[PDB]
Design an enzyme around this catalytic site. Structure first.
Site, PDB file in Angstrom:
ATOM      1  N   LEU A   1      31.507  28.367  38.530  1.00 14.83           N
ATOM      2  CA  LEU A   1      32.527  30.078  38.232  1.00 14.83           C
ATOM      3  C   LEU A   1      33.201  30.028  36.735  1.00 14.83           C
ATOM      4  O   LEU A   1      33.216  29.184  36.116  1.00 14.83           O
ATOM      5  CB  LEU A   1      33.415  30.010  39.386  1.00 14.83           C
ATOM      6  N   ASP A   2      33.217  31.438  36.430  1.00 16.45           N
ATOM      7  CA  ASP A   2      34.222  31.727  35.169  1.00 16.45           C
ATOM      8  C   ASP A   2      35.420  32.154  36.059  1.00 16.45           C
ATOM      9  O   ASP A   2      35.885  32.476  36.471  1.00 16.45           O
ATOM     10  CB  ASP A   2      33.657  33.203  34.240  1.00 16.45           C
ATOM     11  N   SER A   3      36.413  32.453  35.372  1.00 17.16           N
ATOM     12  CA  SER A   3      37.870  32.691  35.337  1.00 17.16           C
ATOM     13  C   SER A   3      38.177  34.662  36.004  1.00 17.16           C
ATOM     14  O   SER A   3      38.878  34.562  36.787  1.00 17.16           O
ATOM     15  CB  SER A   3      38.409  33.069  33.617  1.00 17.16           C
TER      16      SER A   3
ATOM     17  N   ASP B   1      35.977  35.097  38.245  1.00 16.47           N
ATOM     18  CA  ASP B   1      35.402  35.011  39.536  1.00 16.47           C
ATOM     19  C   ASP B   1      36.985  34.197  40.084  1.00 16.47           C
ATOM     20  O   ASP B   1      36.945  34.186  41.507  1.00 16.47           O
ATOM     21  CB  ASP B   1      34.017  34.382  39.828  1.00 16.47           C
ATOM     22  N   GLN B   2      37.917  33.682  39.745  1.00 18.56           N
ATOM     23  CA  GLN B   2      39.179  33.198  39.756  1.00 18.56           C
ATOM     24  C   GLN B   2      40.052  33.902  39.956  1.00 18.56           C
ATOM     25  O   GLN B   2      40.444  33.292  40.932  1.00 18.56           O
ATOM     26  CB  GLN B   2      39.680  31.652  39.069  1.00 18.56           C
TER      27      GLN B   2
END
Ligand SMILES: CCCCCCCCCCCCCCCCCC(=O)OC[C@H](COP(=O)([O-])OCC(O)COP(=O)([O-])OC[C@@H](COC(=O)CCCCCCCCCCCCCCCCC)OC(=O)CCCCCCCCCCCCCCCCC)OC(=O)CCCCCCCCCCCCCCCCC
Ligand SMILES: CCCCCCCCCCCCCCCCC[C@@H](O)O[C@H](CO[C@H](O)CCCCCCCCCCCCCCC)COP(=O)(O)OCC[N+](C)(C)C
Ligand SMILES: CCCCCCCCCCCC(=O)SCCNC(=O)CCNC(=O)[C@H](O)C(C)(C)COP(=O)(O)O
Lengths: 124, 80, 67, 98, 110, 459, 178, 88, 128
Positions: free
Chosen positions: H42-44, H46-47
């Site tokens: 995932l990417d930031s 998504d976090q």
């Protein structure tokens, strides 16, 4: 409302002034006018200590209502006929006041138009 | 006491306004990956609710029935 | 009375609270309807409002624009 | 991104210490070692104050002029006075707008 | 006014305590079925506050409005009183709509 | 009234001959007994005064002040023995001697029949106060404070003496009864104007008047607790007593000579009340509150109406008690944390609940919550001022607001909030301090029960 | 609140913070969940549209314009969690927080009740007293000559060591003390 | 009474429940120690969405400076356990 | 594009709307590093005494002492009579006095003049 619209927007000269009413004598157009009577004496009204505003011409019905309310105290639904009688007298008094205001309106307009017509006739 | 969470696989966006949202997002080429997380708000006992007028007239049927029976009793009681 | 958390379900309801709620709504509506049936004039008015235009000049007492 | 190993290790140790401290806050079964009729409410909270108040009002306050004043009761036509026994007349032959 | 105002506040307090001390109406969903008694009480209170006839609010508010209309009074005050008595109903239905109707919006641990 | 004077003179050798560990006990017990005896002076007449001899007499204005002095001495004794524990025996006896001498001088001051003996004793009260402040104060500033306390008073009182003796050469007497019965009006001349100013300025500076008050924060902040207590509670009231006495020979000049002083008093109560809102020192706030209340008393006396006089007497007594209580309350915290900054130690309601209760009661009494005698005096003064001029209700109204603000402000900052983390030496309140607070506060409410005792001879 | 802050926020941190704030305020505007999901997916697409900009200057200009748009369109009354710094129950339970050193001043009669708790408290006090000097010496060695440059503290590394400056972190009063 | 005494096991189950409800994360692959960037891809953004999901689940806000650091479900469990004084 | 927000004294500028933050330099980064270094040194100094088992009493904060001393004792030594100082002093210390004096003197003169002609309606004014 229409009377406010007539006075504030139309011709205010032929519309009555509530603070200054009536202008014409009470017996102006009437040939004879019966004097308005009372039923409740000053002493009766004072003993009942009604109020200084409830001592109007419908005070006797109010005294009757107060009597019936005191006598039939716990049954507080028993004072129906007298309450209606007092309300009817107050309604009739309001109708009389409405008649007074409307008479002021018609008399003012009639007198103003008659004076204007007399001035016009004397102007030719 | 000693209660466990419901199975996570029963939450679906089928038949919910989230279905409509996903349909409109897919037409734009986008996607919504959190709908199943919001599906519980429409899934179970929260599936339906009254309207505003329906909420206002909550106890109208029983109250109207009581009023009708009281009036009927009153009418055939003055015949004494 | 013991009620326990549900975690994404509708909460547990006891019959008593629904009974009480329905009862009080029903009595409020019955009171409103009964008081309207018996005390209608309190909302619709009791005495007819006159209209000043239909008042004849004779009872009113102004002259026919001559004197 | 995320923690560094020093932060992770310090957090782990502090978390273990904090959990131990919280576990120590629990009370053993003996911890609080304490060292060594129906309608009587309406009598001691209503009856006695009202007795005292009535005694004070009827025997001390009312011993001076103008301390307890009641407005004169309403009198209406057709009423009979208790003391004198007099009657007040009726009201002027009602017009009977029935 | 004392009666239904205090009871409206009490219903609000019950709602607040149940939803883990939450006061924002944006996080209250469908409590018409979840809270039968609280919903009924708040409905009766909002109707009494708004001068529903023959309830406790009618017998004072109706007379007050009708006596304001029939008096030699400032016209601006009359207009503002009427607009205010409409806005009363407005915020009452706002509370009802956002607190009781729709789908839940509160945290999942019910 | 030698039955009151002699027991204090006997307090002296009893203190100086007591055992080294029984000085406080004996002093407290016998001071309390003397206060009980002096309580009998409240049996006053409605027409004249109690003329015990050619030298001493008592009115309805001086008797509550004497009772206040006698009651105050044991309170200072209780509040003093905490911080004097490490002191030597001889110095402790000297401290108690200073307090006893001050009480004796005040007692003889409040009852002298002649204005010149009153002057002698009302200056004699200066020496023990200066010694106490400059010897047993804590910080280096005390020395300067002493100087500000001394000359500010003397520069006001030296002209008065002149006027006094001058009067004796024209009327032939300074006895207060002869002065009252043979009073004559003052003409409108410059000589009479300066005689008025000389007779008035000493008591104006003692109150103090606004613009003449710079000595008061110094004296009241740098002094020890007993010094601050006796400065605020009793010594400020000497000006009020003296002015209410001396105004009998100044009419009708006051009718226009009160204008600058009335203006100063009103605008200065406003200014000092506003000053209280931004004060990082806790003792300075109490000092400036004292200034504001005394400004109200000055206005009351200058108006010269019976209601104003009654309000002035009641406010004098009530303020004395309340200010003394506030000083003790602040001194407890100072003894704990050794600092006077108001925002240093916070959230003390969490740690000391009963002391928080005492703080709340003292703050409520300060802002004149009815039916406290503070409120009675304030309201009588306001009513008399409204009769004097209808616009005063603006300024007084302003004061009635600002006071409350700073009052609650102090409370909210010292008791509420969250406690300071790094302070961990806050021990539970001792029985001595709690008893001190209770003995300060209970007489206030007892006086509320029977307030005719402190309304003065105009009652 | 638990982490030591840094000297500055970088570009990605600022973009992520703007993303979170915009999502929260859009949730405040979009009361209902489905509408929020719709507009949040739209906002996510809008954010990741320029995700591949290699010119840092233009990225900062876009971030600026986005912040101006947010400040213009922000909710005047955004939703705040009850225990958050703007919440209705933010500092509600602070008056119930009492420090532990107060227990040092309890009367012996008060300490007679709860004997086992005070035995464990004596244990903890002995542990702190025995670990203080080692903690201080460890801090001195690890710390740079020109003073610390962050607020981050080191962990324990030796046999029976404890992480330095732990007593007031471990012995917090509680979140719900009374 | 009030809410039950939240425990570590309940917290872990709730976190895993929220994570498995994500369309971008496959349930079988997801474990308690899985890394959002490395293991899950995932990417930031998504976090950030994951952190907001946990905030909505538990009803309290995680500050940004602390939220950015959390990278695995175990880290989130530990943080929430520390915030709510959970020891059992 | 959108209506602009202009700051004031009592409603300042947001940090995210500040142009000074959106154009940075390595000098700015170095300055921020020094600021953190000072803050961290102070925090370490505080935490060293805060956690001391043998520390009993108050941790003296020189900053608080400096604030109090500057607010109270340092004002007069650094005061100079300037046209601004003198004018403000004269205004704020004299103007209210004579303003209120004129107001009250005028009111009392009007009241006394009305009393002299015998028209003030002083009936039932027993107490004063
Ligand atoms: C109107 C009530 C009538 C009641 C009749 C009986 C009242 C007798 C009161 C006599 C004085 C008591 C001693 C006061 C000092 C405090 C002692 C103490 O440390 O208590 C700890 C003790 C033990 O508790 P704890 O567990 O240690 O708790 C400590 C914690 O810190 C927890 O602390 P806390 O939270 O318990 O805090 C203590 C509490 C209570 O503490 C106090 O406030 C005491 C001081 C009261 C106010 C003082 C400031 C205002 C001054 C006004 C002067 C009025 C004097 C009245 C006559 C006094 C005669 C002696 O604080 C308050 O409640 C706030 C007070 C706000 C007052 C609001 C009303 C203003 C005046 C209203 C008019 C009064 C006259 C009414 C009649 C008028 C005509 C109809 O608690 C109590 O004993 C109970 C306190 C209850 C006080 C009631 C306050 C109202 C009554 C005021 C005077 C009543 C006069 C009676 C004659 C009729 C009038
Ligand atoms: C900082 C606060 C400390 C305390 C301050 C105390 C205030 C003391 C002020 C004294 C009040 C009045 C003093 C004199 C009385 C009247 C003042 C004068 O202005 O009135 C007119 C006086 O007229 C002129 O003003 C002449 C006086 C002018 C010279 C006086 C000096 C005033 C300058 C201000 C100096 C500030 C003094 C305080 C220094 C600290 C009245 O006209 P007139 O009818 O003819 O005189 C009446 C007396 N007769 C009947 C015997 C004739
Ligand atoms: C409620 C009303 C208010 C809402 C209005 C808000 C409007 C704002 C919309 C416009 C915002 C933008 O598009 S401004 C877009 C700015 N674009 C860039 O900076 C490109 C460089 N890329 C990166 O910095 C990283 O990849 C990053 C993107 C951070 C991802 O980080 P991660 O992959 O490591 O998680």
């Amino acid at each position: 409302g229409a009377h406010l619209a007539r006075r504030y927007l139309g011709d205010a000269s032929k519309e009555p002034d509530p603070l200054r009413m009536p202008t014409f004598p009470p017996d102006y157009g009437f040939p004879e006018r019966k004097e308005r009577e009372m039923v409740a004496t000053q002493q009766e009204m004072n003993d009942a200590q009604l109020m200084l505003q409830q001592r109007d011409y419908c005070a006797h019905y109010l005294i009757q209502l107060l009597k019936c309310k005191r006598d039939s105290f716990p049954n507080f639904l028993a004072c129906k006929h007298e309450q209606h009688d007092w309300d009817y007298c107050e309604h009739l008094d309001y109708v009389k006041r409405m008649k007074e205001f409307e008479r002021e309106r018609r008399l003012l307009q009639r007198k103003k138009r008659r004076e204007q017509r007399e001035a016009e006739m004397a102007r030719g | 006491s000693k209660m466990e969470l419901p199975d996570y696989k029963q939450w679906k966006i089928e038949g919910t306004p989230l279905e409509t949202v996903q349909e409109k997002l897919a037409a734009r080429g986008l996607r919504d990956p959190w709908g199943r997380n919001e599906a519980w708000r429409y899934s179970g006992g929260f599936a339906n609710n009254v309207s505003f007028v329906g909420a206002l007239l909550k106890g109208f049927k029983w109250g109207f029935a009581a009023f009708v029976v009281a009036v009927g009793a009153e009418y055939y009681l003055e015949s004494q | 009375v013991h009620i326990e958390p549900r975690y994404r379900q509708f909460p547990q309801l006891t019959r008593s609270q629904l009974i009480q709620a329905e009862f009080f709504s029903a009595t409020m509506w019955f009171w409103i309807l009964w008081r309207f049936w018996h005390d209608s004039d309190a909302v619709l008015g009791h005495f007819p409002y006159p209209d000043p235009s239909q008042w004849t000049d004779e009872e009113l007492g102004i002259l026919p624009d001559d004197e | 991104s995320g923690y560094t190993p020093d932060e992770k290790l310090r957090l782990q140790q502090l978390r273990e210490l904090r959990r131990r401290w919280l576990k120590d806050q629990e009370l053993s079964p003996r911890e609080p070692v304490l060292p060594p009729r129906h309608s009587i409410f309406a009598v001691t909270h209503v009856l006695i104050p009202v007795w005292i108040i009535h005694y004070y009002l009827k025997y001390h306050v009312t011993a001076k002029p103008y301390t307890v004043v009641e407005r004169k009761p309403r009198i209406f036509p057709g009423d009979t006075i208790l003391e004198t026994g007099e009657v007040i007349p009726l009201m002027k032959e009602f017009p009977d707008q029935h | 006014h004392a009666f239904f105002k205090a009871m409206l506040f009490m219903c609000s307090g019950s709602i607040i305590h149940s939803l883990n001390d939450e006061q924002d109406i944006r996080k209250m969903g469908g409590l018409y079925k979840a809270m039968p008694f609280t919903t009924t009480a708040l409905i009766i209170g909002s109707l009494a506050l708004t001068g529903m006839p023959y309830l406790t609010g009618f017998y004072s508010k109706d007379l007050i409005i009708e006596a304001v209309n029939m008096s030699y009074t400032n016209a601006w005050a009359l207009l503002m009183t009427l607009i205010a008595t409409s806005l009363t109903a407005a915020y009452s239905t706002r509370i009802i709509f956002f607190a009781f109707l729709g789908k839940p919006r509160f945290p999942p641990l019910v | 009234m030698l039955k009151i004077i002699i027991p204090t003179t006997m307090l002296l050798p009893m203190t100086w001959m007591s055992k080294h560990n029984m000085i406080w006990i004996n002093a407290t017990v016998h001071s309390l007994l003397i206060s009980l005896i002096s309580l009998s002076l409240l049996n006053q007449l409605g027409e004249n005064s109690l003329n015990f001899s050619l030298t001493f007499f008592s009115d309805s204005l001086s008797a509550p002040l004497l009772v206040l002095t006698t009651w105050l001495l044991p309170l200072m004794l209780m509040a003093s023995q905490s911080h004097l524990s490490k002191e030597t025996t001889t110095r402790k006896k000297l401290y108690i001697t200073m307090l006893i001498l001050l009480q004796l001088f005040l007692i003889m001051t409040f009852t002298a029949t002649e204005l010149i003996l009153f002057y002698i004793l009302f200056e004699a009260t200066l020496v023990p106060t200066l010694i106490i402040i400059t010897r047993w104060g804590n910080q280096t500033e005390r020395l300067n404070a002493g100087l500000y306390f001394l000359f500010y008073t003397l520069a006001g009182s030296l002209p008065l003496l002149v006027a006094l003796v001058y009067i004796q050469n024209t009327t032939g007497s300074l006895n207060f009864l002869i002065i009252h019965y043979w009073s004559h009006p003052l003409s409108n001349s410059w000589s009479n104007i300066f005689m008025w100013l000389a007779c008035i300025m000493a008591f104006m500076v003692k109150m103090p008047l606004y613009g003449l008050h710079l000595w008061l924060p110094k004296a009241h902040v740098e002094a020890p607790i007993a010094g601050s207590m006796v400065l605020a509670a009793v010594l400020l009231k000497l000006g009020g007593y003296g002015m209410m006495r001396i105004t009998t020979i100044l009419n009708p000049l006051t009718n226009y000579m009160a204008y600058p002083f009335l203006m100063l008093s009103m605008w200065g109560m406003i200014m000092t009340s506003s000053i209280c809102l931004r004060q990082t020192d806790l003792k300075s706030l109490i000092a400036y509150s004292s200034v504001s209340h005394m400004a109200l008393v000055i206005v009351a006396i200058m108006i010269q109406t019976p209601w104003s006089f009654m309000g002035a007497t009641a406010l004098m007594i009530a303020h004395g008690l309340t200010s003394s209580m506030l000083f003790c309350l602040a001194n407890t915290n100072y003894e704990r944390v050794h600092s006077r900054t108001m925002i240093l130690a916070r959230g003390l309601q969490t740690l000391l609940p009963l002391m928080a209760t005492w703080w709340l009661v003292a703050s409520l009494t300060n802002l004149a919550l009815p039916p406290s005698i503070n409120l009675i005096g304030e309201l009588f003064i306001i009513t008399a001022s409204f009769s004097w001029s209808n616009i005063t209700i603006i300024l007084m109204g302003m004061n009635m607001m600002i006071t409350a603000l700073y009052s609650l402000y102090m409370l909210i900052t010292t008791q509420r909030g969250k406690y300071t983390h790094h302070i961990n030496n806050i021990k539970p309140s001792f029985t001595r301090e709690n008893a001190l607070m209770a003995l300060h506060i209970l007489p206030l409410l007892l006086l509320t029960l029977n307030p005719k005792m402190i309304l003065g001879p105009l009652y | 609140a638990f982490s030591a802050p840094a000297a500055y926020l970088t570009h990605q941190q600022k973009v992520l913070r703007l993303y979170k704030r915009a999502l929260r305020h859009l949730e405040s505007w979009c009361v209902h969940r489905d509408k929020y999901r719709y507009f949040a997916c739209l906002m996510r697409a809008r954010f990741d549209e320029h995700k591949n900009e290699k010119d840092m200057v233009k990225a900062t200009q876009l971030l600026r314009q986005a912040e101006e748009e947010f400040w213009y369109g922000q909710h005047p009354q955004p939703y705040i969690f009850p225990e958050s710094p703007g919440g209705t129950s933010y500092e509600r339970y602070e008056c119930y927080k009492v420090p532990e050193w107060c227990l040092d001043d309890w009367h012996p009669s008060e300490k007679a009740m709860y004997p086992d708790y005070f035995a464990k408290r004596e244990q903890w006090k002995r542990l702190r007293r025995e670990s203080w000097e080692r903690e201080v010496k460890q801090l001195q060695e690890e710390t740079p000559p020109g003073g610390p440059r962050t607020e981050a503290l080191p962990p324990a590394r030796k046999e029976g060591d404890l992480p330095p400056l732990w007593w007031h972190i471990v012995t917090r009063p509680r979140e719900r003390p009374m | 009474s009030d809410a039950p005494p939240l425990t570590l096991e309940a917290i872990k189950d709730r976190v895993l429940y929220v994570l498995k409800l994500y369309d971008k994360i496959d349930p079988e692959k997801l474990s308690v120690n899985s890394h959002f960037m490395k293991d899950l891809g995932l990417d930031s953004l998504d976090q950030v969405e994951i952190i907001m999901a946990m905030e909505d689940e538990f009803g309290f806000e995680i500050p940004d400076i602390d939220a950015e650091k959390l990278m695995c479900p175990q880290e989130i469990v530990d943080y929430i356990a520390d915030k709510k004084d959970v020891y059992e | 594009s959108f209506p602009k927000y202009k700051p004031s004294r009592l409603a300042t500028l947001p940090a995210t709307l500040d142009p000074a933050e959106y154009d940075i330099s390595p000098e700015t980064r170095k300055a921020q590093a020094e600021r953190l270094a000072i803050r961290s040194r102070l925090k370490r100094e505080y935490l060293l005494q805060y956690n001391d088992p043998n520390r009993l009493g108050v941790i003296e904060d020189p900053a608080l002492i400096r604030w109090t001393y500057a607010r109270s004792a340092n004002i007069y030594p650094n005061f100079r009579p300037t046209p601004k100082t003198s004018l403000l002093g004269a205004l704020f210390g004299i103007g209210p006095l004579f303003f209120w004096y004129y107001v009250f003197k005028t009111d009392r003169d009007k009241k006394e003049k009305l009393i002299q002609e015998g028209k003030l309606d002083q009936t039932f004014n027993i107490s004063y």
